[PDB]
């Protein structure tokens, strides 16, 4: 069980740790989060009390280093930093744990919700999308645009998701125009799975990464990417059976976790009705259709 | 974007464009089977591709053999249309290729866009105008070449005959749309107007009669009259 200590909490902030969130008051004696499970990737996110604009945060894996959070009063945000002196870090964490100034990542017997949301998210894979090589953790905020959004303006601060465009020459074989447009299996299985991702594990990971960025940061580019990756599978007549079954499980947990009050904006009516009711896979997503119909029957 | 009454003179500027109408590509007769069920039998069709500035009509004839053993023919027809327009464009020299292609029905946008991905600089556009190009098959010479075709064929016409020698393309398109709108609302009365007089003939190389300027005013007046008598009878006026 690992620890993300905090230098201080000088500004009032709502702090997010995976699917959980808690409030810290201005100058409250808060010195971080302990008992963070090892073996899972994590996200620590931030929403200042004084400015609801700019949810921002850090994706990280405790196995890759000792990380702490310290407020920067010049740039005005909580920053993640790496302490390479392992003894100083051990010495600091133990002091905060003795004075009980750290909140504890909850440990309930009935839970696998974070695992189900992050099954194919990896820290090294994350760095291919969010480029900042000198750090082991990856910063994301609400406003970061995607490479594709930048095609439709700072490239260093972008989200490099895999571009998906259904009316593109990559998507459409010359002479197979109607076939490939109406049945996207070529684009899914050959262009994307066999030539870009390499395996479905990777397809599922970027999709999972896209959903969490959309949900935790309100990143419009991430939301577009998540729906595009769902739509490509559901618009394909030929999809391996194991991929359909996992997709159903993946989506089920995303819909289950989505805050009810943001469904209206987080879920694209057209993509979901098409996927559940018109597409080739309309009959293949039993768990997802059941939770969607019982929880958000208005969107449909 | 979409073409309407507000940007209507753009049809007659010097940017090459083509209208594509697909309403006569897939044509059938519905009939009863010996068992008392219903069946269709396809008949020859055509793509109506028109340059509104020059009057140049690229009539691609769609022979019934193109449907043999195919499924979902109304969907296929849109994709077959787009395949054939794309092939036409590619067959033209670069300086003759259109800058824009206007489809008369919005269901043609995605098929044409996908077939023209190689041409990113050609704009594929819809229109809010309710143009009467479906009545193209009420033109006797166009109907004749479609129904006699025994194989796929492209035939070229000028749908304005020699009118551009005497009137502008804006006026020529107006006259064409008026004639076609009349043919669509009552074809018999329309054709009686056009052909009642046995001394005005259609030249071998023309589609419409050789009307003098004054006779065209009379003709055009008679077509308006016909369109109003039925537009008003519709809603009893
Ligand atoms: O060094 C620290 N802060 C000053 C450097 O800016 C520091 C290091 C690690 C932890 Cl946990 C806390 C503070
Ligand atoms: O849930 C928390 N606070 C109360 C919410 O009602 C919370 C969540 C996570 C941690 Cl790590 C600490 C407190
Ligand atoms: O493999 C990925 N896709 C990009 C390939 O360029 C991937 C996998 C997992 C995550 Cl979390 C993100 C991207
Ligand atoms: O469409 C969005 N917002 C409503 C317009 O104000 C939207 C959708 C998804 C995300 Cl993640 C963010 C914004």
Residue at token pair 């055009």: B220
- Please indicate if any CB of chain A lies within 8 Å of the CB of B112: no
* Distances from the Cα of B197 to the Cα of B183, B192, B194, B209, B222, angstroms: 17, 9, 8, 10, 14
As a whole number of angstroms, the distance between CA A53 and CA A59 comes to 20
DSSP, res A149: G
Q: Which long-range contacts (CB under 8 A, 24 or more apart) does B205-214 make?
A: B206/B161, B206/B162, B207/B139, B207/B141, B207/B142, B207/B157, B207/B159, B207/B161, B208/B161, B208/B179, B210/B161, B213/B166
Domain extent at residue A283:
116-299
3-state secondary structure of B155: strand
As a whole number of angstroms, the distance between CA B40 and CA B26 comes to 11
Q: Name the pairing type of β-strands B27-32 and A103-104.
A: unpaired
- What experiment produced this structure? X-ray
Nearest CA among B152, B155, B148 for reference residue B65: B152
As a whole number of angstroms, the distance between CA A282 and CA A280 comes to 6
Task: Give the CATH number of the domain where residue A238 resides.
Answer: 1.25.40.550
Q: CB under 6 Å to ligand 2: residues?
A: A 17, 20, 22, 33, 103, 105-106
As a whole number of angstroms, the distance between CA A180 and CA B110 comes to 13
As a whole number of angstroms, the distance between CA A29 and CA A8 comes to 7
Nearest-by-Cβ selection for A167 from B79, B82, B114: B114
Residues 6+ apart with CB under 8 A from B221: none
The CATH superfamily of B164-237 is Prp8 RNase H domain, fingers region (1.20.80.40)
For a ligand 3 pocket test, name from A123, A147, A162, A222 the mutation site with the most ligand atoms within 8 angstroms of its C-beta: A162
- Domain range list for chain B: 9-163, 164-237
| Phi, psi angles (nearest 5°) of residue B39 | -145, 160
Q: Which long-range contacts (CB under 8 A, 24 or more apart) does A278-281 make?
A: A279/A234, A279/A235, A280/A183, A280/A234, A280/A235, A280/A236, A280/A237, A280/A239, A281/A233, A281/A234, A281/A236, A281/A239, A281/A244
Q: Is A16 in the pocket of ligand 3 (CB under 6 A)?
A: no
- Please indicate if any CB of chain A lies within 8 Å of the CB of B111: yes
The secondary structure of A62-102, three-state, reads HHHCCEEEEEECCCCEEEEEECCCHHHHHHHHHHHHHCCCC
Instruction: Supply the Cα-derived Rg of chain A in whole angstroms.
Output: 21
3-state secondary structure of B207: coil
* Ligand lying closest to the C-alpha of residue A84: 1
CA atoms within 13 A on the CB side of B17: 20
The two three-digit tokens of residue A47, written as one number: 């929403």
> Strands, DSSP E only, in chain A?
2-5, 13-17, 20-24, 32-36, 42-48, 56-60, 67-72, 77-82, 103-104, 138-141
- Please indicate if any CB of chain B lies within 8 Å of the CB of A107: no
Q: Burial, A204: exposed, middle or buried (Cβ in 10 Å; 0-12, 13-18, 19+)?
A: buried
State which fold the B9-163 domain adopts.
Nucleotidyltransferase; domain 5 (3.30.420)
Annotate B60-93 with b (16+ C-beta within 10 A) or e (fewer). bbbbbebbeeeeeeeebbbbbbbbbbbebbeeee
* B127 beta partners: B3
Q: Which atom of ligand 4 is nearest to the CA of A218?
A: 11
Annotate B182-213 with b (16+ C-beta within 10 A) or e (fewer). bbbbeeebbeebbeeeeeeeeeeebbbbebee
Instruction: Supply the Cα-derived Rg of chain B in whole angstroms.
Output: 19
As a whole number of angstroms, the distance between CA A33 and CA A9 comes to 13
| Residues of chain A found within 8 Å of residue B83, distances taken between Cβ atoms | 177
Q: Name the pairing type of β-strands A103-104 and A32-36.
A: parallel
Contact A247, A285 (CB under 8 A): yes
């Amino acid at each position: 069980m690992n620890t993300v200590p905090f230098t201080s909490a000088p500004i009032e902030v709502t702090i997010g740790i995976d699917q959980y969130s808690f409030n810290v008051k201005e100058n409250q004696p808060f010195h971080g989060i302990k008992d963070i499970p090892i073996g899972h990737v994590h996200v620590i996110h931030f929403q200042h009390a004084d400015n609801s604009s700019m949810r921002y945060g850090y994706w990280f894996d405790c196995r890759m280093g000792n990380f702490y959070i310290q407020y920067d009063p010049k740039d005005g945000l909580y920053k993640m930093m790496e302490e390479r002196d392992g003894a100083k870090f051990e010495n600091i964490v133990h002091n905060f744990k003795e004075r009980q100034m750290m909140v504890s990542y909850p440990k309930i017997d009935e839970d696998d919700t974070w695992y189900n949301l992050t099954e194919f998210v990896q820290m090294d894979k994350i760095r291919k999308i969010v480029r900042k090589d000198e750090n082991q953790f990856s910063y994301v905020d609400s406003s970061m645009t995607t490479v594709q959004e930048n095609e439709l303006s700072d490239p260093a601060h972008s989200l490099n998701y895999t571009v998906i465009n259904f009316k593109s020459r990559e998507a459409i074989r010359p002479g197979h125009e109607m076939e490939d447009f109406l049945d996207k299996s070529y684009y899914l299985n050959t262009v994307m799975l066999q030539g870009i991702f390499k395996n479905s594990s990777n397809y599922f990971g970027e999709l999972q990464f896209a959903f969490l960025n959309a949900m935790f940061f309100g990143n419009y580019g991430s939301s577009l990417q998540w729906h595009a990756m769902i739509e490509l599978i559901c618009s394909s007549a030929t999809v391996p059976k194991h991929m359909l079954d996992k997709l159903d499980e993946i989506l089920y947990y995303q819909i289950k976790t989505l805050p009810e009050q943001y469904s209206d904006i987080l879920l694209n009516e057209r993509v979901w009705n098409i996927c559940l009711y018109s597409s080739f896979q309309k009959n293949s997503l039993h768990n997802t259709e059941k939770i969607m119909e019982n929880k958000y029957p208005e969107l449909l | 974007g979409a073409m309407n009454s507000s940007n209507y003179a753009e049809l007659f500027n010097n940017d090459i464009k083509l209208f594509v109408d697909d309403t006569n590509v897939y044509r059938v007769t519905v009939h009863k089977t010996f068992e008392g069920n219903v069946a269709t039998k396809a008949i020859n069709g055509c793509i109506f591709t028109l340059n509104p500035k020059t009057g140049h009509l690229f009539l691609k004839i769609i022979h019934t053999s193109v449907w043999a053993g195919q499924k979902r023919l109304s969907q296929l027809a849109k994709w077959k249309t787009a395949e054939e327009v794309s092939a036409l464009v590619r067959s033209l020299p670069k300086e003759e290729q259109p800058k824009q292609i206007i489809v008369t029905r919005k269901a043609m946008l995605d098929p044409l866009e996908v077939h023209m991905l190689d041409f990113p600089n050609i704009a594929i556009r819809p229109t809010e105008l309710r143009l009467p190009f479906s009545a193209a098959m009420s033109i006797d010479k166009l109907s004749d070449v479609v129904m006699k075709a025994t194989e796929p064929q492209m035939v070229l016409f000028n749908i304005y005959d020699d009118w551009l020698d005497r009137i502008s393309s804006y006026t020529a398109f107006s006259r064409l749309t008026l004639l076609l709108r009349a043919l669509k609302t009552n074809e018999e009365s329309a054709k009686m107007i056009l052909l009642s007089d046995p001394t005005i003939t259609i030249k071998s190389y023309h589609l419409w009669p050789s009307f003098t300027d004054e006779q065209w005013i009379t003709i055009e007046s008679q077509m308006r009259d016909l369109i109003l008598t039925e537009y008003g009878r519709k809603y009893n006026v």
